[PDB]
Structure 1
């Protein structure tokens, strides 16, 4: 809760080369994510009664926040949560394909990893403008693939995020320019499915 902090990236900026360039990792983490944390803290600073609330809870209750900070919390709180998840999902050294319980749910519900990749790729490519593509779980045990605009996080709608892929141009412009599809092909090489499994089990 408040004051929110920029999480450690956790590995060297060049750990994901040649899939994601080092310069992007640094700017994405230090500048983009760093700015969302600053702005989120700046919004919440004037309302002490919201100081002990986790960001997930603020996002599930946007409509209850003072009107003058709802957009700032949505954008920046969503930006903080989304990127926090993203850095963990990109941790080197994990399974490159779904494993464990998440694997069984994916096989059962989508027919297997190949079918999921295709659906997640379609949702990411179809997100016009800035956004994120997601694999989420609902309270009823079903998995869904969807995309959200800008920094909106699926917890706003009651879902629990499992995998998120950043499709803002800043996530891929330096190395791939307009070629979002090439960026998506490369992301599969660095996703950590042991981390996705933890997210899946935890909720």
Structure 2
């Protein structure tokens, strides 16, 4: 079927004072809403190019399909990886994978904060699992669909676009990145990590 906007499982002002309800609102409502309309739209123009047998604008069509489909895919996962009752540290299988992988929790976290505040332009920090070589790696994604390999399973994303922190942190991106840690919903990530390794 068509893609659609998921609802949040918290009220827009729930991450205050770490992330304002003004931002969650424009973000879920303006920003993600337009990526889901863009995704359904690129889907429908390729169905028509498929019937008129005219692949003359293939390049804008495959570029509009990857851009909206990926902004909706990262957005969808960023709402479930944040929680009002979040913070602290991961536990169980996940916390042991993370120290085995980056040596230690605080080390994984100095690299994740280093990959998210050095993007030149918009992009995000993403923790993913590579099934080719079964490892847990951190990637710096540019924009919404570039800089990582195909088939990588996404587990915890930090949105670096300016719309995610300009109305409250203005240009101090590092303090928005420090505040994200107090709202991480580690239960969602742990659950992502287990279906990833099954």
TM-score computed with the length of structure 1 as normaliser: 0.86
1:99 aligns with 2:94: no
**Contact 2:86–2:182 at 8 Å: present in 1 too?**
no
**Contact 1:133–1:145 at 8 Å: present in 2 too?**
yes
**Contact 2:87–2:182 at 8 Å: present in 1 too?**
no
CA 1:153–1:9 in structure 2 vs 1: closer, same or farther (change >3 Å)?
farther
Q: How far does the alpha carbon of each residue in 1:63-108 deviate from its partner, in whole angstroms, 9 at most, with x for none?
A: xxx4441111111001000000000001332452111211111111
Whose Rg is larger? 2
Match for 2:141 among 145, 148, 160?
148
Match of 1:200?
193
Q: How does 1:78-89 map to 2 (within 5 A)?
A: 78-89=70-81
Deviation at 1:146, TM superposition (A): 1.3
Match for 1:158 among 139, 151, 154?
151
SS of structure 1 residue aligned to 2:179: helix
Match of 1:170?
163
CA 1:149–1:155 in structure 2 vs 1: closer, same or farther (change >3 Å)?
closer
SS of structure 2 residue aligned to 1:161: strand
Q: Give the Cα separation in 2 of the matches to 1:153 and 1:201.
A: 25
Q: Give the Cα separation in 2 of the matches to 1:123 and 1:175.
A: 21
Dislocated runs of 4+, deviation >6 Å: none
Q: Give the Cα separation in 2 of the matches to 1:94 and 1:101.
A: 18
Match for 1:182 among 161, 164, 175?
175
Q: Give the Cα separation in 2 of the matches to 1:44 and 1:101.
A: 38
Gaps of 5+ in 2: 49-57
**Contact 1:14–1:22 at 8 Å: present in 2 too?**
yes
Q: Give the Cα separation in 2 of the matches to 1:102 and 1:187.
A: 19
SS of structure 1 residue aligned to 2:182: coil
Deviation at 1:157, TM superposition (A): 2.4
SS of structure 2 residue aligned to 1:86: helix
SS of structure 2 residue aligned to 1:6: coil
**Contact 2:102–2:108 at 8 Å: present in 1 too?**
yes
Q: Give the Cα separation in 2 of the matches to 1:44 and 1:156.
A: 23
Q: What's the Cα RMSD here? A: 1.8
Gaps of 5+ in 1: 50-65
